[PDB]
Design a protein around this ligand. Structure first.
Ligand SMILES: COc1nc(N(C)C)ncc1-n1nc2c(c1C(C)C)[C@H](c1ccc(C#N)cc1)N(c1cc(Cl)c[nH]c1=O)C2=O
Length: 87
């Protein structure tokens, strides 16, 4: 319910899936990141909980080649490294 402010490059990713504002709830950020993953088919076909994000903007932002969608705490870490103070 509190608002977060994405850094420019995370904001660019969000806007690529139709987001139109500067600040978001965490639930909204997750929804759009999810949309990005699914519409770009970044998940592995055999192990569908694994997202392969090397050579993609998402991998650039998160600083990892891959991650599991089951690892929610690590997902929050990676999102938080891409936020700035809300002014
Ligand atoms: C490959 O992934 C999936 N594949 C399938 N297939 C049918 C193949 N179905 C569901 C998922 N899936 N599971 C979860 C999520 C998805 C989609 C929306 C990416 C989201 C989610 C994961 C990562 C980010 C980031 N960056 C943002 C949202 N997510 C969540 C992650 C967190 Cl932290 C909180 N709540 C969530 O639902 C999950 O558990």
């Amino acid at each position: 319910e509190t608002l977060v402010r994405p850094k420019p490059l995370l904001l660019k990713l969000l806007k690529s899936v139709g987001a139109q504002k500067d600040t978001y709830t965490m639930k909204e950020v997750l929804f759009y990141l999810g949309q990005y993953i699914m519409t770009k088919r970044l998940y592995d076909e055999k192990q569908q909980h694994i997202v392969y994000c090397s050579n993609d903007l998402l991998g650039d932002l998160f600083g990892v080649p891959s991650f599991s969608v089951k690892e929610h705490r690590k997902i929050y870490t990676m999102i938080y490294r891409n936020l700035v103070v809300v002014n």
